[PDB]
Write a protein that binds this ligand. Structure first.
Ligand SMILES: Cc1cc2nc3c(=O)[nH]c(=O)nc-3n(C[C@H](O)[C@H](O)[C@H](O)COP(=O)(O)OP(=O)(O)OC[C@H]3O[C@@H](n4cnc5c(N)ncnc54)[C@H](O)[C@@H]3O)c2cc1C
Ligand SMILES: Cc1cc2nc3c(=O)[nH]c(=O)nc-3n(C[C@H](O)[C@H](O)[C@H](O)COP(=O)(O)OP(=O)(O)OC[C@H]3O[C@@H](n4cnc5c(N)ncnc54)[C@H](O)[C@@H]3O)c2cc1C
Ligand SMILES: NC(=O)C1=CN([C@@H]2O[C@H](COP(=O)(O)OP(=O)(O)OC[C@H]3O[C@@H](n4cnc5c(N)ncnc54)[C@H](OP(=O)(O)O)[C@@H]3O)[C@@H](O)[C@H]2O)C=CC1
Ligand SMILES: NC(=O)C1=CN([C@@H]2O[C@H](COP(=O)(O)OP(=O)(O)OC[C@H]3O[C@@H](n4cnc5c(N)ncnc54)[C@H](OP(=O)(O)O)[C@@H]3O)[C@@H](O)[C@H]2O)C=CC1
Ligand SMILES: [Ag+]
Ligand SMILES: [Ag+]
Ligand SMILES: [Ag+]
Ligand SMILES: [Ag+]
Lengths: 487, 485
């Protein structure tokens, strides 16, 4: 009937998941469209999506590298002795090693397309022509040469999101998360704008890889970084980023940026101050990447900042056109898009339909002291629950009395419904938190109670065993108000 | 009525749990008996039990120290340059800092007793006289001076366990886990006898803290270390301990040990070979410490290796006498004894009786690549289950392509009942495994199914998220047989 069963615009986390699934476990003719084959600074994303090329994968590698600064310093207390006087890392050999790993994943995706029959990779910029036609061009410009014209039954949009910039003079002098991955040298005088995921995470990277006398300044528009997270975790993280070197700067926002006679950028703030930074990164946000896809031509509903209007099954305004991942602007994570993609395949090609559960999704923040959250905060649970108990526990891991890093305090805060005992949210700060929160997310998806926690015999010399030691709540929330006692 | 409500013999993990609980949350007159107040060689354990003084606490500190050997080496690939040749750690400043931490906990317990009313610490060797009288002597000898005579309603035994040696000539030339904590110098030529918990853990410590050209030989009586653990996890550890430096030797056992004219020990093996070790540690096992408690005088039953025979509520032969922890020889762990102790309090002084759940208890092995297990192995689940599915997954963390340690392979193995899909066992090998297994243990006590795992949306750049990626089983066991499908 048609040339392909599916054309996937975007070979991302979600995109490739659906592509492979339709082609292998259903034997369908699948075409996957993407910008380029291997990662690279002209057009950053590639085969594997942001996640693989300019996202989670390289980020984690760099965060792991920066984490050594602490560990090399901490080793002293345990009897490990070396030349610690102004010891600095090699940024060039990090990026070198990072690229070799990213490209290796790029390369194994190439041979995947050469070895899987039904799957075909189509390089270029995809755009919609009608309900059944996707046109591949060599540019985002609608007037540039047409490389391919794909005729398909279904169309899936998985083009993800794209960095947001702030509309100020000197905006193009700044870098984003994209450019950060390919910097020639590690900046000495660094400014991270914003208080989001990337802002906090990258602040840690640069602070680990700063040269001599270098400093990283994080500035945030509001008065507490990481809005939406547990207020007590946020405050404790702010304190710990400081103790680690990163100078946090609340209620501050840049307005003017100009370049100097040495390359460095001159930044003008809100309070009127002027400081000189070698690099300035903007972690403002990520808007869904759909501006060039010509959704109007096919009649696909575009809403909140270019987000693609979808229902619970990812179906758009047109019955055969679907969208998954960051482009839908639901929950912008890698494992979410993968689930949304697998659920899409099961729905249309599998027969048995299934919707993606967006609630109670465990995620992490790979800041130097990492965060692990799943579920509701105090503010949210007290907002729409009758009565809620709040459990709290802060402890310094015993090893840190030797290592010297006494600021490193592990924190667990469980938020439960008082009526039932149901765990509505668990919030963690400290090493191993992203690992621990994963299996917590399993429990919350099972709908677990606080009684299920402190009844499990612990595993002693661990941080996670502290989940099972919280019996008495710190305080309560009664019909909205913060109360220290409950009659 | 009489002097004390409770006399606890042993200020251990469980002993101190039962003491504090009865005294604070029930306002009972509680006496706690122990050998000494601060850690120290002559009699190793102190206030806090084995676990605090010569157990989990110091062990973990030393395992964390050793892990820096890998971490310093691994940093190179990420751009961290320094002097790496001949770089060996300072053992003396490790023990120094270890002692400082252990002593502060000792001190913390000392001020606890002085501030908690009802609780009183009584230094000396406790021994039974009758169903209500506990005698405190200055020595383990039953004829040394009597320091105190405590008269109590209830008696709780929490004296824990003690290292086992092997009956061979040269047995007293060896060290145990106890002496290992207070070695004056890090051994160059090390031998670890046995293939149990302590063996694998300490092998990693000494291998981390070995001087120049040093080596650690681990010898085990059988042909695969750590019996009772997942056979595939065991084999993968054996390779990784090897790759990390430790030379594993199976089907081998020492028989004769003699000292030389420089201090070093000469060891005669099972195959007939002889080799020289600066130090030789015996991780043979731990027998319940009840040899000098005179349970006969009070009429308390001692069965297999002197273990105090108890029911599900810790009650012994006599209705007032109880026992918890390693001395019962049920499950020799710190959090087990704490639970046994807390349940003991609830049983008698709390009103509401409660028994300790010994099945499906998550534990860990702090090897250089750590282990995290909970529930049944393949062998055990195939013995007493109709049909069982075996899920397996091995993967190299992405960072290890840069760090150079490509041998460090993370492994997860889930063992489920094929009938309903119930998770009967989870076995892990790699970093964070002891952290991950804890919340796995929450699920298994919760009675979780494999469908609960792979239906949870993961947390991408983690090792624990792979737990939710196992959908199709590697193979099956059908009525006992290893079945392809
Ligand atoms: C720096 C950074 C770090 C992150 N770290 C994490 C993390 O640690 N954990 C986590 O869960 N999430 C993380 N995220 C988010 C995660 O990377 C995304 O949510 C994920 O990539 C979404 O998958 P997707 O398939 O929807 O989009 P993507 O994976 O980004 O796929 C989009 C692909 O579509 C292609 N494309 C774009 N336009 C077109 C077009 N015109 N025609 C054809 N193809 C096109 C692009 O080239 C791109 O390859 C991070 C994000 C960033 C930016
Ligand atoms: C090296 C090592 C590492 C370990 N690591 C871990 C681990 O990481 N995780 C884990 O879960 N378990 C671990 N264990 C096991 C754990 O330490 C014990 O199971 C736990 O301490 C048991 O608690 P208990 O109260 O029954 O005995 P203990 O905590 O050992 O208490 C016994 C106390 O009784 C005292 N005592 C002895 N005889 C008398 C007497 N005659 N009169 C009065 N008092 C007496 C002793 O001085 C001692 O202080 C480890 C054990 C060892 C040896
Ligand atoms: N799971 C993980 O480990 C990671 C996930 N991600 C995903 O990718 C996305 C990356 O977006 P990111 O921007 O880094 O994080 P966010 O979009 O969550 O947060 C952006 C921050 O920038 C601030 N901000 C927004 N607009 C402005 C402005 N105009 N001027 C100054 N400050 C502003 C916001 O302030 P305010 O709070 O006041 O609105 C907020 O603190 C995340 O949303 C997340 O979904 C990214 C990295 C890691
Ligand atoms: N949870 C944790 O992290 C830790 C817990 N522990 C606790 O300490 C307890 C005791 O540890 P451990 O001392 O290592 O005892 P184990 O029972 O754990 O292991 C003893 C090892 O020595 C071997 N062995 C036994 N008898 C002899 C013998 N006569 N000659 C030669 N080899 C022999 C055994 O092999 P085989 O019997 O298979 O032939 C076994 O491999 C453990 O049960 C555990 O509860 C200790 C350290 C860490
Ligand atoms: Ag990713
Ligand atoms: Ag559960
Ligand atoms: Ag302990
Ligand atoms: Ag669970």
């Amino acid at each position: 009937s048609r040339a392909y069963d599916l054309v996937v615009l975007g070979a991302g986390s979600g995109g490739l998941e659906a592509g492979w699934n339709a082609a292998v476990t259903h034997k369908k003719k699948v075409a996957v469209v993407d910008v380029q084959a291997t990662h690279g600074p002209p057009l950053f994303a590639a085969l594997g999506g942001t996640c693989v090329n300019v996202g989670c994968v390289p980020k984690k590698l760099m965060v792991t590298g920066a984490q050594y600064m602490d560990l090399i310093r901490e080793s002293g207390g345990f009897g490990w002795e070396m030349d610690r006087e102004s010891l600095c890392p090699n940024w060039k050999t990090l990026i070198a090693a990072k690229n070799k790993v990213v490209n290796s994943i790029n390369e194994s995706y190439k041979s995947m397309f050469a070895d899987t029959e039904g799957l075909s990779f189509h390089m270029g910029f995809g755009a919609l022509q009608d309900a059944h036609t996707v046109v591949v061009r060599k540019s985002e410009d609608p007037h540039s040469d047409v490389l391919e014209t794909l005729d398909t039954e279904y169309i899936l949009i998985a083009t993800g999101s794209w960095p947001t910039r702030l509309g100020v003079p000197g905006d193009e002098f700044c870098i984003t998360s994209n450019e950060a991955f390919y910097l020639e040298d590690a900046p000495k005088r660094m400014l991270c704008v914003g208080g989001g995921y990337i802002a906090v995470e990258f602040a840690g990277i640069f602070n680990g890889y700063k040269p001599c006398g270098g400093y990283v300044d994080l500035c945030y528009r509001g008065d507490l970084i990481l809005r939406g997270f547990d207020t007590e975790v946020r405050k404790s993280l702010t304190k710990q980023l400081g103790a680690n070197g990163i100078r946090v700067r609340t209620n501050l926002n840049p307005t003017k940026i100009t370049k100097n006679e040495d390359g460095s950028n001159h930044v003008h703030f809100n309070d009127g101050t002027e400081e000189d930074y070698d690099q300035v990164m903007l972690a403002i946000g990520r808007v869904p990447r759909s501006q060039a896809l010509q959704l109007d031509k096919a009649g696909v509903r575009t809403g909140k900042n270019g987000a693609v209007q979808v229902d619970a099954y990812s179906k758009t305004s047109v019955d055969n056109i679907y969208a998954i991942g960051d482009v839908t602007n639901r929950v912008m994570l890698t494992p979410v898009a993968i689930n949304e993609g697998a659920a899409f395949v099961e729905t249309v090609f599998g027969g048995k339909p299934r919707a993606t559960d967006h609630t109670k999704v465990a995620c992490a923040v790979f800041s130097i002291p990492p965060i692990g959250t799943c579920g509701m905060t105090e503010e949210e649970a007290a907002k729409n629950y009758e009565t809620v108990a709040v459990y709290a526990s802060s402890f310094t891991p015993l090893m840190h009395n030797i290592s010297g890093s006494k600021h490193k305090e592990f924190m667990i805060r469980i938020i439960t419904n008082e009526s039932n005992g149901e765990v509505l949210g668990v919030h963690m700060l400290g090493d191993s938190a992203p690992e621990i929160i994963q299996s917590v997310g399993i429990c919350m998806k099972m709908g677990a109670k606080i009684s299920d926690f402190h009844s499990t015999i612990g595993v002693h010399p661990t941080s996670a065993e502290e989940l099972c030691s919280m019996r008495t709540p710190a305080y309560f929330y009664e019909s909205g108000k913060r109360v220290e006692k409950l009659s």
